[PDB]
Amino acid sequence: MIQKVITVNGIEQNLFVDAEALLSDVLRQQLGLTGVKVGCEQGQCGACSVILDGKVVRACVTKMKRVADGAQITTIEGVGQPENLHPLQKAWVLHGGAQCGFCSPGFIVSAKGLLDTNADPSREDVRDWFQKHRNACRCTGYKPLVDAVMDAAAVINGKKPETDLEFKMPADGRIWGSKYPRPTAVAKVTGTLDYGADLGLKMPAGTLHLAMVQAKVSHANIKGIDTSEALTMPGVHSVITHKDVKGKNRITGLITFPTNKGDGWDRPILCDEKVFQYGDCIALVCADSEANARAAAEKVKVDLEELPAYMSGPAAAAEDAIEIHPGTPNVYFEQPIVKGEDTGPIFASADVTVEGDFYVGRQPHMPIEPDVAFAYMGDDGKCYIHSKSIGVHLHLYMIAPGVGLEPDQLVLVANPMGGTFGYKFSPTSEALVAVAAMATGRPVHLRYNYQQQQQYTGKRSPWEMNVKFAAKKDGTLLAMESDWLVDHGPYSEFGDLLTLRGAQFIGAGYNIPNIRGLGRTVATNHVWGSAFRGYGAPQSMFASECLMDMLAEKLGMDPLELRYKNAYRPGDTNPTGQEPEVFSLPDMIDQLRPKYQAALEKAQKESTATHKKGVGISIGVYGSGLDGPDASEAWAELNADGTITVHTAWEDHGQGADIGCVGTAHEALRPMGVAPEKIKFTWPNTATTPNSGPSGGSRQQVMTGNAIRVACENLLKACEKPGGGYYTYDELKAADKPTKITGNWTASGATHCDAVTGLGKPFVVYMYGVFMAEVTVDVATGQTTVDGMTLMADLGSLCNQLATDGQIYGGLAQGIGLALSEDFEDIKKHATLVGAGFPFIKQIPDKLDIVYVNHPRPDGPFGASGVGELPLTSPHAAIINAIKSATGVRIYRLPAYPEKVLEALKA
Amino acid sequence: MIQKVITVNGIEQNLFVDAEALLSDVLRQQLGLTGVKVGCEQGQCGACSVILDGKVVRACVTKMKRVADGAQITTIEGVGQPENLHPLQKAWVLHGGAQCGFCSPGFIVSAKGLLDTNADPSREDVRDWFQKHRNACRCTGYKPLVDAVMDAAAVINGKKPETDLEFKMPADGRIWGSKYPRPTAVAKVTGTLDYGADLGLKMPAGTLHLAMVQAKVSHANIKGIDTSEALTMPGVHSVITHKDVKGKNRITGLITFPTNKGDGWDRPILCDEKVFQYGDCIALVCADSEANARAAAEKVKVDLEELPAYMSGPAAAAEDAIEIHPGTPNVYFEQPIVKGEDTGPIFASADVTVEGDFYVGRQPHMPIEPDVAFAYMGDDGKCYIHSKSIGVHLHLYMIAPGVGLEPDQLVLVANPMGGTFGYKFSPTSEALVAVAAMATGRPVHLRYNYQQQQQYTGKRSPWEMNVKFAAKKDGTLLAMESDWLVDHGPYSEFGDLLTLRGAQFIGAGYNIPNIRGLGRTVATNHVWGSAFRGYGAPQSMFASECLMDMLAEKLGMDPLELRYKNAYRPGDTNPTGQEPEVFSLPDMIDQLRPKYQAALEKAQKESTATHKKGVGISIGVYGSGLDGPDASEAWAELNADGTITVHTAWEDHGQGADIGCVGTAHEALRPMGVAPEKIKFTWPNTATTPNSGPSGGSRQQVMTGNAIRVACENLLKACEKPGGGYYTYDELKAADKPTKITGNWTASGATHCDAVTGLGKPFVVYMYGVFMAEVTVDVATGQTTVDGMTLMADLGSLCNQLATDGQIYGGLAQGIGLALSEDFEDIKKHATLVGAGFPFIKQIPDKLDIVYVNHPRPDGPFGASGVGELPLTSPHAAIINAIKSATGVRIYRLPAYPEKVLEALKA
Numbered sequence A, B: 001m002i003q004k005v006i007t008v009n010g011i012e013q014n015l016f017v018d019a020e021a022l023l024s025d026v027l028r029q030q031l032g033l034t035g036v037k038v039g040c041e042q043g044q045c046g047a048c049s050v051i052l053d054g055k056v057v058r059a060c061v062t063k064m065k066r067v068a069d070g071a072q073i074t075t076i077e078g079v080g081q082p083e084n085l086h087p088l089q090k091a092w093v094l095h096g097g098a099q100c101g102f103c104s105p106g107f108i109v110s111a112k113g114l115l116d117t118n119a120d121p122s123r124e125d126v127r128d129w130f131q132k133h134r135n136a137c138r139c140t141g142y143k144p145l146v147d148a149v150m151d152a153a154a155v156i157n158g159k160k161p162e163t164d165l166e167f168k169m170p171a172d173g174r175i176w177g178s179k180y181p182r183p184t185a186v187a188k189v190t191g192t193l194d195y196g197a198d199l200g201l202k203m204p205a206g207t208l209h210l211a212m213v214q215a216k217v218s219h220a221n222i223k224g225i226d227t228s229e230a231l232t233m234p235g236v237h238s239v240i241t242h243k244d245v246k247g248k249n250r251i252t253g254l255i256t257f258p259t260n261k262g263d264g265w266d267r268p269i270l271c272d273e274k275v276f277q278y279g280d281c282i283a284l285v286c287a288d289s290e291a292n293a294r295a296a297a298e299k300v301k302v303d304l305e306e307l308p309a310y311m312s313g314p315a316a317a318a319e320d321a322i323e324i325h326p327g328t329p330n331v332y333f334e335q336p337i338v339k340g341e342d343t344g345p346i347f348a349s350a351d352v353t354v355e356g357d358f359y360v361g362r363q364p365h366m367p368i369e370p371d372v373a374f375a376y377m378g379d380d381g382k383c384y385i386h387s388k389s390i391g392v393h394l395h396l397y398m399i400a401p402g403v404g405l406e407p408d409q410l411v412l413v414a415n416p417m418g419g420t421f422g423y424k425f426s427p428t429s430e431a432l433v434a435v436a437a438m439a440t441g442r443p444v445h446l447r448y449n450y451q452q453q454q455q456y457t458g459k460r461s462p463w464e465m466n467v468k469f470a471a472k473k474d475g476t477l478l479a480m481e482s483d484w485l486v487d488h489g490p491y492s493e494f495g496d497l498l499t500l501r502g503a504q505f506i507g508a509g510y511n512i513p514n515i516r517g518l519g520r521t522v523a524t525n526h527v528w529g530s531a532f533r534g535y536g537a538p539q540s541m542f543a544s545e546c547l548m549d550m551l552a553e554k555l556g557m558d559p560l561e562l563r564y565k566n567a568y569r570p571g572d573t574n575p576t577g578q579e580p581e582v583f584s585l586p587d588m589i590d591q592l593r594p595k596y597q598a599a600l601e602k603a604q605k606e607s608t609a610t611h612k613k614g615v616g617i618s619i620g621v622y623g624s625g626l627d628g629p630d631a632s633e634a635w636a637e638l639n640a641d642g643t644i645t646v647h648t649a650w651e652d653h654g655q656g657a658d659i660g661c662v663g664t665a666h667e668a669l670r671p672m673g674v675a676p677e678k679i680k681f682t683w684p685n686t687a688t689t690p691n692s693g694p695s696g697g698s699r700q701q702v703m704t705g706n707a708i709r710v711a712c713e714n715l716l717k718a719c720e721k722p723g724g725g726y727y728t729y730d731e732l733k734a735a736d737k738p739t740k741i742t743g744n745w746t747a748s749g750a751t752h753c754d755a756v757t758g759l760g761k762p763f764v765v766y767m768y769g770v771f772m773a774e775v776t777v778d779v780a781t782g783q784t785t786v787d788g789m790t791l792m793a794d795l796g797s798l799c800n801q802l803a804t805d806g807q808i809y810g811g812l813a814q815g816i817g818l819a820l821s822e823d824f825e826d827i828k829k830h831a832t833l834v835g836a837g838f839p840f841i842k843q844i845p846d847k848l849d850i851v852y853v854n855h856p857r858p859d860g861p862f863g864a865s866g867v868g869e870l871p872l873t874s875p876h877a878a879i880i881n882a883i884k885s886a887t888g889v890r891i892y893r894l895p896a897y898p899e900k901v902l903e904a905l906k907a
C-alpha cells in the first residue's frame, strides 16, 4: 500500500491505495465520486474520463502508480454542481445532450480538457477530440454534444453572455412543441443521478454481491454442479442453483400465440437440465464484493455433456435437426400474410418482376451502461427488484410464477438507466436477483461486465428473407411475395410477435393490393431474441426498400419517383388491409425532391476515380402501440404545496419519459395556468404507479400521453369552481373533495392481425418517414463513409423538440452501424464495443438533417405520434442504396464490411 | 431493507437502508459524508449533529426509521465548501474556533439550526442552544464558538457586511503577534480534513478492521486463549496474539532513570503471562469490518487466574504488598529534593507553620475523538503507522524492538487528530496495528470506541501529597517540606520523570531557600499513567497554592498580598536552585490587584443567604521544554513555484502546529518579503521530516520555533545576492546552489536535575501566570458554579493571538472540570463523557478574561515562551480557594463534588 497526497476537485486528499488499483475504483469506491461512470471497463467508451494533470484519461485503465504525489484530478463533481453549473453543463442541458445521461459526465470532463487546450475549436476539432479520447454515445448521434461544446466555448470566450445558456420561455407560456429542457438533465450533467451500479456502491454493508456461473459452450445436457472449492474462497456467503428456486424456475412468454407450437415456458431462470446458449446462468455466487464473487465463480465446476449446437436459423430449421426443446419442433411458429388475389398469375402476366434474397443480422444493443440490478426483502415481506426493466408490470407477470411469488408479493421498480434500445423489453437479471434475495433473505446486487452485456443479453434476431415484386411498366405495384425465417435463439418470448411484424411491415409505405407470404420462427443456440429498436421493421424494410431500388433500376426509373408513384394515398391500404390514418408520404417526397436532386449533382461533381459518391433513398413506417386495443392509465394529483404529480409507469430508457410527462401534462393543464416546474413525474413502480404499459413499440407518447391528457382534463374538472376559476388544494380538502384523479385511454379502433391471413388493424397511429443517405466509397479498400443523413419525419405534433431531434439523431447513428459495422456473430470477437463495430464519432456525419412534415393524428394526444423507432426503420436501406448509387454494387447481407464491398466491386 | 427517497444537502438521494441503521453510518459510509463526525456514539457530544426537517439531531442516535420519505437533511457539506463558505464557517475561521476541529462541523450545523429559528440570539441564547443540543468541545473553552455565532448572525441579519468576516492584514505585513487564521481552519470547518476514522472509511477493500480482545478483570495470570468460535464468525480473517509478535513484545520507556528499580521494559504489546489492568489487549480480531471484528472479539475465550488487584497508590505501596511485576518492588522510584539548610530546625523556630494533605486524581483526557490508528506494509518493505502520536520519533524507538523492526524499517506518521491533551505522549494503538500489519501483510485499521478511550488509554496519575510551609509573621517563606506518592498504574513509561516534576513545581513561584522533600512512584493495577496537560504541575501546585491560602489565613493576611511578598524577584531561585529567566509575577499581581479587590466587593454585595460568592487566587509556573539541553531541527526550502516549505515534525494535537510554523517562519523571513500564504508546513513523518521532538512539555514554540527561525535565517543567507536583494529559485538552480537549508537549535544552558538533590537548571524558558476564579456555591446543594476566570499570562511574545487565546480558554475549562466534576475512578461509571464529568457549555463561564503581561524571554524565538500547559497549572487551586472564600470550607481532595462540599458545609 502507498500513501498519496493529491488534489481532487480542488481539495487535498490524503489517499491510501494499492499502486495496482484502478483510478476508477479509487474515485468511485474509496472517495464516493460516482459521477465517474464506468461502462466498458476496457478503455473504449470514455464514460470514466477524468482530468489528470491537464490530460484527459480513462480512469478505468489508469492505475494508481501513474498518479504522482501532488497530482491534480478533476471529475464531473469538480466541473460543477446543481446551482453551480459550468457553462458546459448548462450548454448540455440547453441542447438536450443528456438522454440516458450515462456518457454525459465523461463527455463534459473531456470537453473541459479540450477547451483548456483549444479555447475556440472548430466543429471538426471537437469531433477529432472526442474520437481521440474515445467518448462514446449510443443515444444522441453526437451532433447535440458538439452543438453544446460550441455554445459553451463562445460563452467561455466572452463572445456571448452566459445567460443565453438558460432556456427562455416562449412567453405564450407553452412548452408543448418547445425546446424546454428535461427535468433529469441537471442530475445527469452533474453526475448526481444514481444508476444501478452507483446504487450498489451506496447500499449497506451486508448487501451481498453476485457473480454468475455461466455456460462456456453453446448447447449441453447438465449432469451436476460442484461448488465445494468456491465455498472456501474469500468473502463467499453461498452459491445459489436451480435447487434454491421456489417456483417453476421458468420465465413465461405470457402472450405466446395460440398457434405457437411451444407453450412459452421454455426459458429457465437457473439452468437445470440443459444449456441452451453460451452464457446461460447456471449458478450465482453470493459474496462480500463483486470482485470476490467473480473470483469464486471461476472455481464452480459444472459437469456437462456438450451437444451439437445450431448457430443459425437455416441450420436449426433443417427438416432433420434435433429438437433443442425436446417435444417442440425448432420451427415453432408460422405467420401467413394473405391479402387480395393469388399472386402467381399476377407475377406471370406482369410487365416487370424483381426478386432478392436479403439478410439482417444479430445487432447488439450496446448501451454504454452494462446490465445491472438488485433485489431485497422489504420489511413488509414483499420482494423488491430494482433494474433496467422498461416494462415493470410486464416483467412482474413474466417472472412471478418462476420465482414462486404471487403478484402482490413482488414489486418491480425501474432504476435510472444508461440506455437499452429494447434489450430491456426482456427480463435479464430480475429473476436471478429475486431468487438470491429470497434464498438468502439479504439484499443482493448483480452487475454485468461488458462481455456479459454482449454475450448474455438478448439481441436483434437475424432474418433470412426473400421478397418479390410484380409491377406495371409505369411503376405501379401489382403484387408482392415474401418469405422470412427468424432466428430467435433458444428463448421464445415475443418471437412469434416479432415474426408477425414481417407481415405488417415488409413492403409497408405503398399500395400493394395482392400479397402472399409466410414468416417462420426458429429456435437456435445463438443468443436469444430481445426487442431491438424497430423490432422487425429494420429487417422487413431493409428487404423491401432495397427491392424498391432494384425495381426502379429494372424499369429505368428514378427510385424517389417510383416511391412517389406508389406511396399511400386516400383509398389505399397497408399490408394488413387497413387504411392509413394520415397521408404524408407524397408531401414528404415532394419536399425532399429538390434536396435529392442537388445531392445527386454534388455526388457526380465530387466523385473521383478512387472515391465514389452516391445518394440513396428509403421509406420507413412503424406503429405506435402494442398490437390491438392497447391502453394506458395515469393519475393527476394536486399536492398540498400546489405542485401537481402525474403518476405513471412510463419507463425511461433515456428517451425522455420525464419530459414527455411534463410537456403533455403542461399542455393539458393550460386552462389552470400550471407552470412546468410545478409538474412532477414518477419513476416506474408496480406497487405505487398505474399499469401504463412498457416503453416498447414507440407507444408511450400516444398511449400514456393520452392517459396523462385525460387524467389532467379530469383533474381540471375536479378543480373547477362554479362561476369560473379553480379551487386551491386547501379549498378542496376543506370540502372533502378528491385531489388525486384517474385518467385512462384505450386505442379502441385497433384489432389484432388474424392468425390465418395476417389481416387486421393492429395500430391506430403509425410513424412515417423518408430517408436520404449521402456516402463516399473508397473503391480501393471498400470502406464507406456516411457524409450525410436526412430524415423527413411526420410525428403529428412535437411534445418536445429536444427530445424528438435527439431520438432521430440517435436512430440514424444506429442505422449507420447496422449498415456498415455492427453484428454479434462471433461470441468472443464481438463481445467488445470495438470488436462489434460500435460507431464512434467520426463514423457519424456532423450533417444529420431533420425536416418535420407533421400531419396531426386523429387519435394522438394533441395530434402526436411516437418517434422512438422511426429513425431505425430503414436508414440502413438508404445507406446500402447509396453504396449502389455510388459504385454499382448491391450488398444484400448486412453489414457492408470493407472486404465484402471489395469482393463485390471486383467480381 | 427499505427504499427512502430524501434530499441531502439539496440533492435528491435514492437511499437503500436498514430501518434500524444509524443515520451517522448511513451518511458516513453509504454516502461518503465524513464531515459528519462521530466521537462518543452515545448522543452526548454533538459531533454528529445534522439538520433533519429543521431540527438539529444527533445522527449517531437517529435510526433510519425516523427519517421520513421526503425528509430534508443538511450536513456540514451542505452548509458550505471551501471557496463557498457560509458566514458561520467564515466566522469560525476568523475567531479561531477550530483548534483540533473535530467538533467544528457539529457546532456549525447546530448553529445554523439555531439561527434558522432565532436570527438574533443573545450570547446566553447561544449557550442555552449548545447545552440543549449537547455540543461538546474540549479545546476552546466555548467562548470563541459563541463569538463566531454572534458575528455570523450580524452578517446574516444585514447589520454588518460579509467582507468583515475576512481577515484584514495588519499592513505592516506582519503576522507574528496577529490574529491571522490557521491554515487548517478552512478544511476543519468544511469537514474536508480527514481524521483517522475518516481515513479508515476511505481505505481500500481488503483493508482489515481490528477489534481488541480485552481483559475484563484488573489483575491476573493468563493460562490460555481459545479463538476457535471467533474464527467461524462472519467476515473473520484471523486472530492475532503475542505468539504473532516478531520482537520483544514489550514497549520500552526508553529514558528510564538509572535509579528506577525497574528496567522500563514492563509494558507488553499483547499480554502474554499477565493482565496488569482492566482493558489490557490480549488479542486482536482481524475482519472485513469493525462491526464483524467486534462481534467476533466477544467470542474469544481467555482462561485467567484472577489475582488481588491494588487499585490505589497507598494500597500498592504497603510494605507487604505483592509485586505486580515480579522482581521489581511496586514502589520503583524515589526523587528527593534537598535545597539549602535542614528544614526541621527552621520549622521549630518559625513564627508560623502550616501543613496539609491533598489529593488530585485520575483525570481523563476526554478528547471528542476516540483513539484510532492504522498500519500497512509499504511496497518499499517498511511498516507504516498512521496514528494520533504527538511524538512520532519518540514512539518509533519505544516500539521498534517490541514489534521486531530496525528503526529504518518502521515509519510513523501523525494523522490529523481530534485532541489528545497529552494521552498521546504514550503509545496506545501503534504497536497493536504494526503487529497486525506485519503478521497479515495487509492494511489494518483499529478504532477505539468511547468506552475504550476512557478505560484503555492512559490517565493523569493520582498524587497523594503532604506539603508544609514555615514562615515569618510578615509572610516571608523560610522553608518547605513535601511528600508525594504517584499512582502510575502498571506501565512505567515517564513515571519517574513525572515524579521529578514534584521536586520542580511544588511551591514554584516563590523564593524558598530551604526545602526537604521526597517523591515516590508506585505501580498499581488502575489505569497506567500518560501525560495530561500540566504533567505534574496540576498535582504539585494544587497542593502548594492551596497551602499558600492556608498560610495567609493563619497570618490574617490577604492571599494575593502574601503571594506578592514572596513572588520571584532578581536574586531569587526556584525549587531546583535555578534563577528565573524573567521576573513578571510582581507585575502581573500589581495589574490584577484592583480587579481582585473589585471582585471581592462584588462577591460580598451579591452573596445571599443560600448562594455564597467567593474569589480565589493562584500562581502557575511550568517549563517550556523537555528536561536538560533539549533540541530541535527544521528545514527551510525554496520550492520551484516560489513557495517555501518549512519541514518539521511539530505534532498537531489541535493546538496550532500549522500556524506556529507559518507565523514563526513569516517573522524570520521578513527581510525577503515572503507572504504568509506562500509558507507551507509538513505533517509529521519519521522518514521525511526532521526529529523536531514531541509536542509535550509546552516545548514546540520554543524549541521548534527557534529551529524554524534558524533554518529561515540560513535560507535567507543562501538566497542573498551580492550587492543586496535575493536570488530566485531559478537563479539558484542555474548556479547549482542549494535550495533546502537546515537549521538546528539547542537549549544549551539547561542541565538535568540531580538524582540525589533534585537541583539543576532543567528548562531555560518557563511560563508564568496568575489566576483569579469567581464562584457561587449553593449551600443547600453544595453545587459550585464558576462565574468567571481570569488569567494574567506572561508568554514573552505571541506568535499568534487566536492560538494563544484559545489555548488559555481551553486550559481554564479543563481546570473547572478538574476542580469540580472530573475523574476516572470507577471503571464503568466513568467510561462516558457524562459519567466522568465532562464540562458542557453551561459549566464554563462566558467570562474568561486574559491579560497578557509579556516579558520577552532571552532564549525564546522573538522572545516567546510556550503556552500549552500554563492555563492548567493551577486554575483548580484558584477555584477551590474561591469556594473557601465563599463558604469557609476547604476541599483537599479533588473533585469538589456537591455531596462532598455539603458534608464539609455541615460538619
Ligand code: FES
Pocket (backbone or CB within 6 Å): A037, A038, A039, A040, A041, A042, A043, A044, A045, A046, A047, A048, A049, A058, A059, A060, A061
Ligand atoms: S473507457 Fe473506462 S469505462 Fe469505458
Ligand code: FES
Pocket (backbone or CB within 6 Å): A097, A098, A099, A100, A101, A102, A103, A104, A136, A137, A138, A139, A140, A368, A418, A419, A654
Ligand atoms: S446520452 Fe450518451 S450514451 Fe445515453
Ligand code: FES
Pocket (backbone or CB within 6 Å): B037, B038, B039, B040, B041, B042, B043, B044, B045, B046, B047, B048, B049, B058, B059, B060, B061
Ligand atoms: S453525539 Fe453522536 S457521536 Fe457524540
Ligand code: FES
Pocket (backbone or CB within 6 Å): B097, B098, B099, B100, B101, B102, B103, B104, B136, B137, B138, B139, B140, B368, B418, B419, B654
Ligand atoms: S476544537 Fe472543539 S473539540 Fe477540538
Ligand SMILES: [Cl-]
Pocket (backbone or CB within 6 Å): A890, A891, A892, A893, A894
Ligand atoms: Cl451481400
Ligand SMILES: [Cl-]
Pocket (backbone or CB within 6 Å): A897, A898, A899, A900
Ligand atoms: Cl473487413
Ligand SMILES: [Cl-]
Pocket (backbone or CB within 6 Å): B890, B891, B892, B893, B894
Ligand atoms: Cl476533601
Ligand SMILES: [Cl-]
Pocket (backbone or CB within 6 Å): B897, B898, B899, B900
Ligand atoms: Cl455529588
Ligand SMILES: [Mg+2]
Pocket (backbone or CB within 6 Å): A085, A086, A087
Ligand atoms: Mg461559473
Ligand SMILES: [Mg+2]
Pocket (backbone or CB within 6 Å): A511
Ligand atoms: Mg390506385
Ligand SMILES: [Mg+2]
Pocket (backbone or CB within 6 Å): A899, A903
Ligand atoms: Mg476476400
Ligand SMILES: [Mg+2]
Pocket (backbone or CB within 6 Å): B085, B086, B087
Ligand atoms: Mg453565501
Ligand SMILES: [Mg+2]
Pocket (backbone or CB within 6 Å): B511
Ligand atoms: Mg529576599
Ligand SMILES: [Mg+2]
Pocket (backbone or CB within 6 Å): B899, B903
Ligand atoms: Mg454523604
